[PDB]
């Protein structure tokens, strides 16, 4: 009478390190608690008044940022339910590019209110059905909440104004300058054809002069030097070669079979003369810049120097392809001279130093091209990385705007209106699903509450004022960040707008993640074992 034996059956057949959680309070409540904890960890980085977090991964690499997706990626999350919510957030990041923190916060609030509903006496199936009905109602309502459209994407000023809000959450101190940079870079890209490519925007990070010295360049910048003596060209005629800048060899096996003295004497001279003829034929086409993806032969470098040809070496094939796109050349596979249509053209190619970094610049004069590069300056590598993340967010926002031009008010207006409308709808729905619908509506309050908490004011007063104002009928009114007291202001006039697609996909993914977490009843965890990767 001193020990409790394991119950006969499955409790005894379990492995030595496995775990089995079954039932409501043992599995569902624990999963809800873990997801709420994850949302709590990520909550403080929401909105313009969010706080950066120093995250050090297992490789002793330091990350400082307020991007929810990056923080979740750099964390070693172990709980399976939190893993599922993190997968939902990453999927939202991949599909849209912004709203990961919205997804996490909404999922956490939904799961907390689902736990409350289960405690008051509701069933999991009823809660799931109510959540699905309310999500359908929210997706129906959302198009009616659109306040304005982009209506133009070739304009620098309009694009900068549209993208200011996206990059106001990150780098809240100075977003106008970054908005102008990203607007110029995106307008250079996105030609008359409606297709926009995210990868056409390149980011180069160089230390030393602070982010205020950053600029956009119509071309590409490579952080290396030139092989030859020529370091600057004014009417460049780039000829790109994917093959190494050397005489091609056989593929099976090459053996120089010498049988007489004369062949031994003449072999090297003939080889040098042949490659001289090749290089002179290359140069006679007017080409003056040569870019190669392979190694550069010493004698080839000599004979290119003799003919005043700039040599640039690109190790990565991605850089070669991007340079071909941004100059208009075709990557030749042999040392044949380029034909007229395969000869790339650039306004100016030169070797320059920025800070203490030697770079080669392919510069255009036209405000167009296939690829544009943003040169980022700063006093810290982590700062430039965070600015690059903000630039990525802005570019993704531009891509979303190209896909869909509809916008909804930000700053707490959209979700407050959604909550009010869904609450009104739920009161007209008889049955047990009304509780779940009302909880789904109330879960939208987590966004203005988080914004108010990060802003340093009392969230309850802000929420009450927002409900009042929306009760009069001002659906474009959100909380005012630049105020020491709880206050609200119109968001359409202030230009604080977020994309319709972002809200749509974020709501869909958060609801899906919450429902999928709720559907789980039993957890059978195996022994962790190893597997570091």
């Amino acid at each position: 009478a001193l020990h409790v034996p394991k119950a006969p059956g499955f409790a005894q057949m379990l492995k030595e390190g496995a775990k089995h959680f079954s039932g409501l309070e043992e599995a569902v409540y624990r999963n809800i608690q873990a997801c709420k904890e994850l949302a709590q960890t990520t909550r403080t980085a929401y909105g313009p008044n969010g706080m950066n977090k120093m995250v050090i991964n297992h490789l002793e690499k330091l990350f400082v940022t307020n991007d929810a997706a990056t923080i979740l990626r750099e964390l070693e999350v172990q709980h399976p339910a939190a893993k599922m919510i993190v997968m939902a957030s990453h999927m939202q990041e991949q599909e849209v590019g912004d709203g990961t923190n919205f997804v996490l916060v909404f999922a956490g609030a939904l799961l907390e209110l689902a736990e409350e509903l289960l405690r008051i006496g509701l069933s999991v199936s009823e809660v799931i059905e109510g959540y699905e009905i309310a999500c359908r109602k929210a997706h129906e309502i959302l198009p009616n909440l659109v306040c304005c459209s982009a209506k133009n994407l070739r304009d620098i000023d309009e694009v900068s104004s549209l993208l200011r809000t996206s990059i106001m959450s990150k780098q809240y101190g100075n977003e106008v300058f970054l908005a102008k940079l990203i607007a110029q870079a995106c307008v250079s890209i996105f030609p008359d054809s409606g297709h926009f490519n995210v990868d056409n925007i390149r980011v180069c990070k160089i230390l030393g002069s602070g982010i205020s010295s950053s600029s956009v360049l119509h071309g590409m910048v490579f952080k290396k030097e030139t092989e030859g003596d020529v370091t600057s060209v004014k009417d460049a005629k780039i000829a790109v070669y994917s093959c190494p800048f050397d005489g091609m060899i056989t593929e099976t096996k090459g053996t120089v079979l010498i049988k007489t003295a004369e062949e031994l004497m003449n072999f090297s001279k003939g080889e040098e003369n042949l490659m001289d003829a090749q290089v002179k034929a290359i140069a006679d086409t007017g080409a003056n810049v040569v870019v190669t993806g392979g190694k550069v032969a010493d004698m080839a470098l000599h004979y290119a120097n003799k003919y005043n040809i700039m040599l640039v070496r690109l190790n990565s094939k991605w850089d070669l392809r991007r340079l071909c796109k941004t100059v208009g050349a075709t990557a030749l596979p042999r040392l044949t001279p380029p034909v007229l249509e395969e000869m790339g053209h650039c306004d100016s190619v030169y070797l320059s130093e920025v800070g203490d970094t030697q770079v080669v610049v392919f510069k255009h004069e036209k405000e167009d091209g296939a690829i544009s590069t943003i040169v980022l300056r700063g006093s810290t590598d982590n700062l430039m990385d965070d600015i690059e993340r903000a630039v990525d967010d802005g570019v993704n926002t531009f891509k979303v705007l190209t896909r869909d031009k509809r916008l909804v008010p930000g700053g707490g207006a959209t979700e407050i209106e959604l909550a009010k409308q869904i609450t009104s709808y739920g009161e007209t729905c008889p049955g047990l699903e009304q509780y779940a619908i009302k909880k789904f509506a109330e879960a939208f309050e987590a966004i203005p509450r988080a914004l108010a908490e990060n802003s340093g004011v009392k969230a309850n007063e802000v929420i009450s004022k927002l409900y009042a104002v929306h009760q009069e009928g001002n659906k474009n009114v959100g909380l005012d960040i630049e105020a020491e007291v709880p206050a609200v202001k119109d968001m359409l006039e202030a230009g604080i707008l977020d994309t319709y697609l972002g809200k749509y996909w974020a709501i869909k993914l958060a609801t899906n993640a919450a429902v999928t977490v709720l559907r789980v009843d039993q957890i059978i965890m195996a022994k962790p074992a190893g597997g570091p990767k």
């Binding site: 057949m13 399976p80 599922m84 939902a88 099976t252 042949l274 039993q522 957890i523 059978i524 074992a529």
Partner: protein, 527 residues
């Protein structure tokens, strides 16, 4: 202790009632785990591997494989369920439940001093009677679209969410009807199942063609061809090494250049053959040429093909050869010795879809494809696996319903009727095997019990209501999972595969008889 332990001191032995108790305890544990799986009202289970991979499923076989069990009887039952899944693709949870209930009912009489042999004899007699009744009760019908849709819905609703099940029902029924050839066995290899991870779970659909998980490697090839000629080939277009250690010898740079230019003539001849065929079939620019090669294509041949406006795919799957031949209608080629326009497939639209690093090629708008693909879509990885398992189960169910001209009513009605028939037949069995027959009937009665329990209703009261209704009316009434009242499965459309029921009966009876007759469990292979 026992005789074996004297010869091998560190041996584990369980003799007489110990072995029976161990086996019955293992079966009861497995049944208790898998009770919650049965029915569309069953509960999803989360499975986490050692590496941390998350899997959500309700399938009996998947759950059994992912269970952390090291028991011999559990291994035997898992093997039986694995065979069940391999042949029929359904009824694994029902298999485990019936085996466990058979063992429990047998133990109920064995604990009273009865020998298991009489129980096994009663089991065999009751199995024969049950098979006869199942033959008598099956509903033979023409497998039109409605019946196949009903069967697919009945499987997928038990496998996934109701709306996703409704979508997958149309998907699977249309796919099976697409590949089906009159009076021929259905080749399930011709339905490619492809997973993409960008849209929602309800965005999965059926493409009347093929989807390839790789695209053209040359950046300058066309991203979309409207009218296309399909060339399915198995010819290597990359550089090939001489089998007899050739090597090159030269005495000057010019000789080296000549040898380099002449070493690619062999592949260039085949490339020229392909280019000449392309020029012959489509001299204009309206039509297009698509080449799918099971072997690789080196960059030189890729550039040569792209110069002629030809999109080419390399390192395709081996099954894709037959899939393209049946879908596009061409002829797979292992050599270009004699290639003619009649060996070229056709496709009304070819385009490439990019998803992150992954590249996907779509071959749609075929004339009358005998091979199609199912594009599984979802936001997660576990969602894709769950949908793939559900799709496999639905495909197996529809194929079984097509193969067997008959279909069996579901919701446990067939088993309630079978139990009543067994009870009626019990007096005709001589000896004490009538106890075995009664145990068999009670064992088959588990499925309506488990369905009612999962739906939340009272077990015994619902079961007696079902039995009373069946006795009064004589119809095939099963458990209604929404109200608990008796319902005619045939009228509603809850259908079960006849082959699934037959295999369930055979396998469960055989394994229960074999386990009951085991009187010793040994492990003496060490030292």
């Amino acid at each position: 202790m026992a005789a074996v332990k004297t010869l091998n001191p560190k041996a584990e032995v369980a003799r007489a009632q110990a072995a029976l108790a161990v086996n019955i305890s293992a079966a009861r544990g497995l049944q208790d785990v898998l009770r919650t799986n049965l029915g569309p009202k069953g509960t999803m289970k989360m499975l986490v591997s050692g590496a941390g991979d998350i899997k959500l499923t309700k399938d009996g076989n998947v759950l059994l494989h992912e269970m952390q069990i090291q028991h011999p009887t559990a291994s035997l039952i898992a093997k039986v369920a694995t065979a069940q899944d391999d042949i029929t693709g359904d009824g694994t949870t029902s298999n485990v439940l019936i085996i466990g209930e058979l063992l429990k009912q047998a133990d109920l009489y064995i604990s009273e001093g009865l020998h298991p042999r009489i129980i096994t004899e009663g089991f065999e007699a009751a199995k024969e009677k049950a098979l006869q009744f199942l033959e008598e009760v099956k509903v033979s019908r023409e497998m039109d679209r409605e019946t196949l849709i009903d069967v697919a819905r009945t499987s997928l609703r038990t496998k996934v969410h109701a709306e996703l099940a409704d979508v997958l029902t149309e998907a699977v029924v249309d796919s099976i009807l697409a590949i089906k050839k009159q009076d021929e066995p259905i080749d399930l290899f011709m339905i490619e199942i492809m997973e993409m991870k960008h849209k929602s779970e309800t965005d999965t659909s059926l493409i009347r063609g093929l989807v390839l998980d790789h695209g053209a490697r040359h950046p300058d090839m066309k991203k979309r061809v409207e009218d296309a000629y399909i060339l399915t080939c198995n010819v290597s277009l990359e550089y090939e090494k001489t089998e007899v250690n050739s090597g090159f010898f030269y005495k000057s740079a010019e000789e080296r250049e000549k040898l380099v230019k002449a070493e690619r003539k062999f592949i260039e001849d085949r490339v020229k053959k392909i280019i000449e065929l392309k020029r012959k079939v489509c001299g204009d620019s309206d039509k297009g040429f698509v080449v799918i090669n099971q072997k690789g294509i080196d960059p030189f041949s890729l550039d040569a093909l792209s110069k002629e406006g030809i999109v080419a795919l390399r390192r395709a799957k081996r099954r894709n050869m037959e899939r393209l031949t049946l879908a596009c209608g061409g002829v797979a080629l292992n050599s270009f010795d004699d290639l003619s326009p009649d060996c070229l497939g056709h496709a009304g639209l070819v385009y490439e879809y990019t998803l992150g690093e992954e590249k996907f090629t779509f071959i749609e708008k075929c004339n009358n494809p005998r091979s199609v693909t199912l594009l599984i879509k979802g936001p997660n990885k576990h969602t894709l696996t769950q949908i793939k398992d559900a799709v496999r189960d639905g495909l197996r169910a529809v194929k079984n319903a097509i193969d067997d001209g008959c279909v069996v009513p579901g919701a446990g009605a067939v088993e309630v009727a079978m139990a009543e028939a067994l009870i009626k037949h019990k007096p005709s069995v001589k000896g004490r095997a009538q106890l075995g027959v009664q145990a068999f009937a009670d064992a088959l009665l588990i499925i309506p019990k488990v369905l009612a329990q999962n739906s939340g209703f009272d077990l015994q009261e619902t079961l007696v209501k079902i039995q009373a209704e069946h006795s009064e009316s004589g119809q095939l009434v099963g458990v209604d999972l929404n109200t608990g009242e008796p319902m005619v499965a045939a009228e509603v459309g809850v259908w079960d595969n006849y082959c699934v029921k037959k295999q369930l009966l055979h396998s469960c009876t055989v394994i229960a008889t074999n386990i009951l007759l085991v009187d010793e469990i040994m492990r003496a292979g060490m030292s």
